[PDB]
Amino acid sequence: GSISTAVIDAINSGATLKDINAIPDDMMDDIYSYAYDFYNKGRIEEAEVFFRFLCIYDFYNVDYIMGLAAIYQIKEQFQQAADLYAVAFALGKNDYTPVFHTGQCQLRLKAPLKAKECFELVIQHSNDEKLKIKAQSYLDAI
């Protein structure tokens, strides 16, 4: 998947498509919009291909990673979703939304202590009051 592509690219250290600026930002923006058009219409398989394409070109982009993580969560591929949400958090250290979703994934993966840790981080550190309520509702059930 996207993560193995990122690791392989790092192992090989060769020039990537991003290193040579193979696709301009404006075209990448257009493809992202097309990807979400597919998603919004229920064409989840095509949206997944487009998000995979974006994550091959520019893996270290929070917007691309979050879109793919959400698709995996919808598809109940909870470990892949959790791994990508964690990448998104590392890329965007001040948004606890991916931490909240990681917690949901961990609960579905039968890892309630990991889930609890995720939800507690939201409560302690997020300034999104609505996200905090949602995190607390999961904590109340754990």
Add this chain to the structure above:
Amino acid sequence: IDAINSGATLKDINAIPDDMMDDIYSYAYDFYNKGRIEEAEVFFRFLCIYDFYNVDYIMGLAAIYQIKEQFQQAADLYAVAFALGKNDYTPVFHTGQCQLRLKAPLKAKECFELVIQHSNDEKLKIKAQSYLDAIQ
């Protein structure tokens, strides 16, 4: 070959026994500790080809890249290592070091602050605070 075509790791198919993999990891660390950086790099690349999802294998390769002053390449792997491990902030600490070397002090500060705020590793937090104390 089937794993190449299906994206599965060599670890997934048990291509090398577990104890032999332990030995290879220990030999990689031995090269690293002895300053045999070229050999350590070969060995950590070998390990990461074998199991791209092994956090410690990735951390070894990232450390090599950081020692070699390939700071962006190190930071990229550290982000993966962090994500696969979920709750180990050591890769975030090293990313902060890389960002300082890349002349991105605001990014580094965010890394060290995240370590302070989330890590339960008191020795790691002490190191992170020492970097924060120095950031202008």
